[model samples]
Target: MIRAVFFDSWGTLISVEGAYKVHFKIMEEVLGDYPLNPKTLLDEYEKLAREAFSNNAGKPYRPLRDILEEVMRKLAEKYGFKYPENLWEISLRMAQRYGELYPEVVEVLKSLKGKYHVGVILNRDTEPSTAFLDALGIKDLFDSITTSEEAGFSKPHPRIFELALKKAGVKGEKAVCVGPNPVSKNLGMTSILLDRKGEKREFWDKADFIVSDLREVIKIVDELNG
Candidate 1:
């Protein structure tokens, strides 16, 4: 029987639009004279950030802010724009507005509250993750919150899920992981892919279940617990 539910923060429990939009707005303000469209700039920035994050995973943990700063500097040189002096401050503000919860998140979490330990296992720095969760008014709902920085590893690494399972005080078989990634399946935990966009990825087949709505998690949890 399942005793806990673990969620991925970005792209699962919350939309990542805030992160993208905030950075886009900042780019427009700081690089106004640059010829590239702001949207193109943001896309390039996101791609670089993802590559940096992937390259650094399972290595010594680095703060995301530092990574973003480096990416910003690189983009500045490539695009011929001055890097903003207050990038970190703007990043903190972006964190504060990071993402709003999906419409079904609050209700689904509430439904699981007393019945199962609900936690977040995220690939993020603690401060920014906490800032957004608090800003979204959902921080108090989690029984445990684990981040890659705290775990010393990110998802697809068994260590992070093991750490999260330890925090939840449940064995892998007795917990459910709800996220867009298939890494949670590595632990023998029931993996539910939260494919909100319905992207057809072959790797996603590794997940035991696929759901587009947070509300679907409640039914899966109930059935699993039964």
Candidate 2:
């Protein structure tokens, strides 16, 4: 039987106020003196960021803060821009200002938890109290929350899903991980992706199941559990 739901926390549950924009804003704020447009800066950021990740493979995992800070420093030098004084702290404040949840995501989760075990499998070091969840007034709703801080691995890493399974006391086939990201494209569990107006057809194809709205999740789960 489908026993648990493993969720992606950031973009899937508590979404950012345009994550890419947040990064752009940070660079604009920190490197404002440079003669660069935000659009151009973001494009440069992407190119350099890919170089940073390619350089990171096979190394012990660096936290998001470290990875981003490294990218920023390299980008600074790549274009003769200067790195900021506060470094990681600047990224932290900018990021904390960027995330919130969807009302529909809350409803489907509430409905699902009534019948099955529920857990989170996030690729972040979310604050232990899920202070953001508390801010959303639904912190207590989750049965377990496993973050990159706690999991020691991030998705598309199968072991992260395994951690959530271990926490929820279920196997991969018996759980579903729902989110908007198509990032975990190769994990083992049943993953439900949320897209709209046939917008994210790739996620639809990649995930075990996909829905345009979270409200449709219960119907799928009922079919699974039936």
Candidate 3:
């Protein structure tokens, strides 16, 4: 029976304010005589960020800074722009900025309280994840929090999910993992695609449960528990 919910931190629980804008704004200033738009720049950031993480498999966890440095450098090269001497310094600063919690986050956590063991399973370093959660004023809400630094692997890796399950004292069948990645379905736990960004239908089609609203999590869990 489902008795725990493991949430991905980035797109699942916290929403960033101007997360991509920092990169776009900085890059636009450096890119000379080239076509540029925020939407395209933001898209590139997302694409490259995921690629950065995925490419990092079997390598030492460089944490967020090193990956984003590579991201900015690669994007600069791809767009035919010269890398600034100062580099993506501002983007790195912005990465440490705390993201705003979704409106439904508190209420959904409240609803799930006492019903299931709640924890976080994310692709972040432990220091930042703990600080971010504390900044959101919900650090104490979770029974456990796991990061790539702690787990030594990130999702769609089974070991990461296994670590979370171990912390929660449950097997995969007793927990549901929720995150934006469609590939999270392979995590051995039941994976729910949390598509707050309204991804294309095909992107969410693979998940057993899909939700855009955070409150929907409680409803889905209730049904699962029933």
Candidate 4:
């Protein structure tokens, strides 16, 4: 039987489209004088950011601020643009203005609350996740929220999910992990991939279920519990 449902915070429950736009705007403002293409610059930022995370795995925990700052510095060096002086301030604002919850998130989460322990598991700093949830009036809805900073490991690393499972008081087999990645499936939990954009990536096959909307989770969970 399922005892808990863990939702990936960023892409699954909260939409970060606004955050991406904010990053692009900052990049353009900082590199406007350069001849480089803003799109290419943003792509490079994402690539470097991914590399930063992958390389740092199993190492000491570092806040998203430090990783992003390092990425920005690299971008400046590679593209020959001056790094923004208020790097930390910019990152803080981006975190604060990340994004709003999706249309069905609140309703879906509310529906599932009493039936199972509802929790959030994501690779983010604690401050922004807490603040964002509070600002959106949904922080109290979650039974638990797990962040990489608290776990000292990110998703795809079993330690993080293990910590979350401990918080939820359930084993991997009895929890359903819903996220955009295949990490949950590999952790021996029921994995539901939230492919909201319909990207249909190849790795999605690893997920137990694929959904384009949050409401679908309700049905899937209901069927599983039955």
Candidate 5:
């Protein structure tokens, strides 16, 4: 029976909203009519953000703040403008702003909290996710938060998941992983995709479950526990 529910940070528990718009506004102010459309800029931002992690990519993982600054700088360079001195400040504000939970998140987590050992196993630098959760008024809800910064390893790697399982005092079988990434199946946990954005390309065949709403997670866990 499942005794724990492990969640991925970005898509599973929380989302970074309005990042592209926030950055685009800054770009518009500085560049006075940049060439790339918002969609393309958003795509480039995502690619660069993924590259910051440095697990599968050849580059070493950088400090999260450093990567954010680098991303902003790169965007500026792409538009042929110098990065603003106050960019770090603006990025922090946006990070804090974007740390919004999806509509059903808090209620679903509240439903699951008392019944299961809830945790977040994230491929993040460590500080940001925690800060965001705290700001969102749900930091104390989690029993454990294992990050790549703390684990010395990233997701799809057994080491981080193993550490999280150990921290929660459960084996992989006793845990269900909720994330956008299908690769969490690598850890031998029941994997559920929380596809709130309704992306067409997803791991339908691979995942044990796929949920569009966080509330659906409660029923799934109830079924699993029974």
Candidate 6:
């Protein structure tokens, strides 16, 4: 009896690009510690931003926001830039304004909410933008959401999975995690890697299931339920 399904935010329920640049610009402005000129700003900061993921090296999951802010802070310190004191809230607002859900989000949630206690377990800050995803006529879709910002830890950390399980009231026998590369980074969970094209490589071993589409998700849940 699988009564719940916990989803990963980026790539799983939503996209990480597009309006995301707006959030980056906001972060740049708040960090205000780089770019001696407009040309240098784009060049150096872009590298720093992209490196954020690669810089993780051997960690299961790195807190992306912390890395981004740290990159800004350090770069600013080296280049003689002053940080905006209000970066935290601005970052939160940037989250709200950017980070979009996939086109299938609303309808899929509508279909799943009644049958399963659906939720998101993602690596995010205190004021994660996904809260707005709910406001888009899909608020009732989730029974709970676990954000790193609120929970004091990000995914790949054991607590993140624990929190999801606790809130969903689901045990390992009946729980599943879904996302592009979500389950590969954590422990104590049955995962479904609904990955996109490439091998993003998170928690593959933990993946008890995998799919390429949300409808396929329906098929999985229905099969298990049946």
- Which is superior by TM-score, 4 or 5? 4
- Off-target runs (Cα >4 Å) in candidate 2 are 14-17, 50-60, 126-139, 181-188
lDDT (tens digit, per residue) of candidate 3 on 1-226: 8999888756776565544444555556555466776567668878988788778864655677667677878877877666656554444444445346677888887777788999888777787667767867888888889887877765556677778889999878889887877763344578788887686479776778888887888888888878
Pick by lDDT: which candidate is best?
A: 1
The lDDT values for all models are 0.81, 0.68, 0.73, 0.80, 0.72, 0.65
Q: Count clashes in each candidate, considering only residues at least 3 apart in sequence or on different chains.
A: 0, 0, 0, 0, 0, 3
Decreasing TM-score order of the candidates = 1, 4, 5, 2, 3, 6
Candidate 3 at 148: error in angstroms?
1.1
Q: For model 6, how does the per-residue alpha-carbon lDDT over 49-101 read when each residue is reduced to its tens digit?
A: 76775555334555666776777687667667685565656755665666566
The local distance difference test score of model 6 is 0.65
**1 or 3: which has the higher lDDT?**
1
How much does candidate 2 score in TM-score? Answer: 0.79
Cα lDDT tens digits for candidate 2, 56-75: 43344457667767777777
Q: Which runs of model 6 end up more than 4 angstroms from their true locations?
A: 27-68, 129-139, 149-152, 182-188, 198-206
Residues 9-102 of candidate 1: C-alpha lDDT, one tens digit per residue: 5778766666567677776766767787988888888899889989987776778878988999999888888888888777667656545667
- CA deviation > 4 Å runs, candidate 3: 16-18, 21-48, 58-60, 72-98, 184-187
Writing each residue's lDDT as its tens digit, candidate 5 over 1-226 gives 9999888756576554544455555444444455656566656777887776654432333466667688868977886656668665665566565545677778877788878998988767777667766877877888998887776655556677888999999888889988877654455689888777678355666788988877887789899877
Residue 155 in model 3: shift from native, Å?
A: 2.7
Report residue 57 deviation for candidate 3 (angstroms). 4.0
Name the 10 consecutive residues with the lowest summed lDDT in model 2.
Answer: 53-62
Q: Best TM-score goes to which candidate? A: 1
Q: Which stretches of candidate 4 lie over 4 Å from their true place?
A: 29-37, 184-187
Candidate 1's C-alpha runs over 4 A off are: 16-19, 32-35
